[PDB]
């Protein structure tokens, strides 16, 4: 019920200095210790700092944190690659007999330069194809920024409805995004066409590139 | 080092019940308050449960307060939590964790924290996954397809870890159908391919699933 509420967002260029608050009330963060937790994609949650401004073993002092009243504040100083994470502050709240609040969490991404993709494209298996399905998969790897458009032609038709899309989380070192697309076909619909093609529109292209294959080739 | 290691995960059915384990080593867990912290699949954080070293202070949030139970048996050096009557918003990576403070006896610090056991709440039926090859096209991209698997999660290792770089393993997107799909890829130099043997290995624990799939340049 009782919330601390952060930006939802947060971003930086390497180096930059970024900060993240966590708003309270007197119940929570104007009574009792803050603590910081981080997250990187794809793991459970390191304590960063505790107790307000302690930082553990382990953590680099460019993090630290503050407290003041009924507001806390974590700073990254000289944003890195390998801090793109999630960043939940979190304290005791005393209303309601006790209870441990976390916060709504902030995502910090970096700022990078824009980076055109590159594009592969996967035919089915023929082990797929034995059990009646075919999936073309279409890779845009090592691009930023996030936003990108993927669009399907089969011998030129436009495809739409049977595609799905997944993008991944921030290169923990390059700070770029990849990005498979996977059409899904029936056997049958399959072999009654011949060019199979992926267009990719991005900032980074001044024009859409395609990747395609001629099926059987 | 201080190691957590819970299990006990997959797939349950609403209304049913799960119980998690925890193992910790590295520490004298005898002296340490353990808590249990869970977060659903892309949202934030949410404290479960407390209790201290010797049981005698536990503590609920009010969303599990008389469904989920909390203990511990220190000469197993293990933490547990019955969870009864599971709703779908149940359905959260349950983390285990270790308090700073030894001999406390309210509150909450998480010092170290286990990786998590996803626990899926639904009413879909466990199926492992078929994996297939996404053969290769001096950078060349090649992968693996592991497709049509319920519920999350799955890994995927090249040449069982001895392959890192380059490595792109994708969220999984639930298909129209319910089941999951995903795809990993690595890019490698092409010179790389008649030379090199390169193996995805999938492991899906819920179907208790491992496969190794050999990914091999097109004949043409
Ligand atoms: C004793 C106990 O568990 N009391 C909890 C209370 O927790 C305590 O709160 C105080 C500050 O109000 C303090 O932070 C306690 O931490 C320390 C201490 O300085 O006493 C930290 C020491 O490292 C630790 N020593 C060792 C060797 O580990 C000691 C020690 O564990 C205890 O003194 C007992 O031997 O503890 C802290 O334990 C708790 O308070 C909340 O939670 C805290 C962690 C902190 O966030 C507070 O700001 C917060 O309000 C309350 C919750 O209502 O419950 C009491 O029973």
């Known amino acids: 019920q009782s919330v601390l509420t952060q930006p939802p967002s947060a971003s930086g260029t390497p180096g930059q200095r970024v900060t993240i608050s966590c708003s309270g009330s007197?119940?929570?963060?104007?009574?009792?210790?803050v603590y910081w937790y981080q997250q990187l994609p794809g793991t459970a949650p390191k304590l960063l700092i505790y107790?307000?401004?302690q930082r553990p073993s382990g953590v680099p002092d460019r993090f630290s944190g503050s407290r003041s009243g009924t507001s806390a504040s974590l700073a990254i100083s000289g944003l890195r690659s390998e801090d793109e994470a999630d960043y939940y502050c979190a304290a005791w709240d005393d209303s309601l007999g006790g209870h441990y609040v976390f916060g709504t969490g902030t995502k910090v991404t970096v700022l990078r330069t824009v980076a055109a993709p590159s594009v592969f494209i996967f035919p089915p298996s023929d082990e797929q194809l034995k059990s009646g399905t075919a999936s073309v998969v279409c890779l845009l790897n090592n691009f930023y920024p996030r936003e990108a458009k993927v669009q399907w032609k089969v011998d030129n038709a436009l495809q739409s409805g049977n595609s799905q899309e997944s993008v991944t989380e921030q290169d923990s070192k390059d700070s770029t995004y990849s990005l498979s697309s996977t059409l899904t076909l029936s056997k049958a619909d399959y072999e009654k066409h011949k060019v199979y093609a992926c267009e990719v529109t991005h900032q980074g292209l001044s024009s859409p590139v395609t990747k395609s294959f001629n099926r059987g080739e | 080092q201080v190691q957590l290691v819970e299990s006990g995960g997959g797939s349950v059915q609403p209304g049913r019940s799960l119980r998690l384990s925890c193992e910790a080593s590295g520490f004298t867990f005898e002296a340490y308050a353990m808590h249990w912290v869970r977060q659903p699949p892309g949202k934030g954080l949410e404290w479960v449960s407390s209790?201290?070293?010797?049981?005698?202070?536990?503590a609920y949030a009010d969303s599990v307060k008389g469904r989920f139970t909390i203990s511990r048996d220190n000469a197993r050096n293990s933490l547990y939590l019955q969870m009864n009557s599971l709703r779908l918003e149940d359905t959260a990576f349950y983390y285990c964790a270790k308090d700073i403070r030894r001999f406390s006896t309210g509150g909450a610090e998480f010092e170290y924290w286990g990786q998590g056991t996803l626990v899926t709440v639904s009413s879909a039926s466990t199926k492992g996954p078929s994996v297939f090859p996404l053969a290769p096209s001096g950078t060349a991209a090649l992968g693996c397809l592991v497709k049509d698997y319920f519920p999350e999660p799955v890994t995927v290792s090249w040449n069982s870890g001895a392959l890192t770089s380059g490595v792109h393993t994708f969220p999984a997107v639930l298909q129209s159908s319910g089941l999951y799909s995903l795809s990993s890829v690595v890019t490698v130099p092409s010179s790389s391919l008649g030379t090199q043997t390169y193996i995805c290995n999938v492991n899906h624990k819920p179907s208790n699933t491992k496969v190794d799939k050999r990914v091999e340049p097109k004949s043409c």
């Open positions: 007197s119940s929570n963060i104007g009574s009792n210790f």
């Open positions: 209790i201290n070293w010797n049981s005698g202070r536990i």
């Open positions: 107790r307000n401004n």
